[PDB]
Amino acid sequence: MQASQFSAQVLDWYDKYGRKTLPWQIDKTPYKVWLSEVMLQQTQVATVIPYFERFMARFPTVTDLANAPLDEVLHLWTGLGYYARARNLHKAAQQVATLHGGKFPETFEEVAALPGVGRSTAGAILSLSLGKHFPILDGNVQRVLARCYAVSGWPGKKEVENKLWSLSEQVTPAVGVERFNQAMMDLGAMICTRSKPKCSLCPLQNGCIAAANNSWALYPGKKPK
Ligand code: SF4
């Protein structure tokens, strides 16, 4: 389907059915969006919310986080697993305090230079908190695009990764970028699931190639054996 129809149908779906009341979606800032993205990378939303609230109460600003002892950050992280994320979280807070005056940087290159922040997380921070015109590509988003446009191939091959980034740029609009990027995460998390997707609930069902052929299991490709 035409990219302008993809974006319009996802935005109309988000308006009526999307998630808008998570704590990191209200009175949004770059700091709140970065902290939530790091916690969500390897942990489900229901488990993250109490940790997000405890971190914002103890560390109201990125300078408070930077000046705290690392052992206190690791103690508050206990139960989230994947603690390389917490070691990098503290180093990134120290980089913002030291290079950027305690104010989150607003250019793609300076955000992506932070430890623990790659290409997709950088675009998420700048689009969701300030409305800058960048697309995202985490596992949820990649599954929706690979099924709708029939992208086989393992995304761990560079040519396949590059095709998925170009597709994401093509369907992501500038007007409503914050709504669109959250809506793509909601679709992959709750509707276009790994097993047995809920196509009847999906706003792309009228143009999706996997839905038309009942072939969702082929997309994205798996690692070769
Ligand atoms: S129609 Fe089905 S397979 Fe296609 S993007 Fe939606 S949930 Fe995924």
Swiss-Prot record:
Q: Which residues of the full protein are shown?
A: 1 to 225 of 350
Q: Name one GO molecular function term.
A: 4 iron, 4 sulfur cluster binding
Q: Which reaction does it catalyse?
A: Hydrolyzes free adenine bases from 7,8-dihydro-8-oxoguanine:adenine mismatched double-stranded DNA, leaving an apurinic site
Ordered alphabetically, the record's keywords are:
4Fe-4S, DNA damage, DNA repair, Glycosidase, Hydrolase, Iron, Iron-sulfur, Metal-binding
Q: Which family would the database say this protein is a member of?
A: Belongs to the Nth/MutY family.
The record's Gene Ontology biological-process terms are: base-excision repair; mismatch repair
Residue positions annotated to bind [4Fe-4S] cluster are: C192, C199, C202, C208
Q: How does it assemble?
A: Monomer.
What are the required cofactors?
Answer: [4Fe-4S] cluster
- Which EC number(s) are documented for this chain? 3.2.2.31
Q: Which domain of life is it from?
A: Bacteria
Provenance organism: Escherichia coli (strain K12)
Q: Which gene encodes it?
A: mutY
List the residue(s) that the UniProt entry marks as the site Transition state stabilizer: D138
Q: How is the cofactor bound?
A: Binds 1 [4Fe-4S] cluster. The cluster does not appear to play a role in catalysis, but is probably involved in the proper positioning of the enzyme along the DNA strand.
What positions does UniProt annotate as the active site of this protein? E37
UniProt-recorded name of the protein: Adenine DNA glycosylase
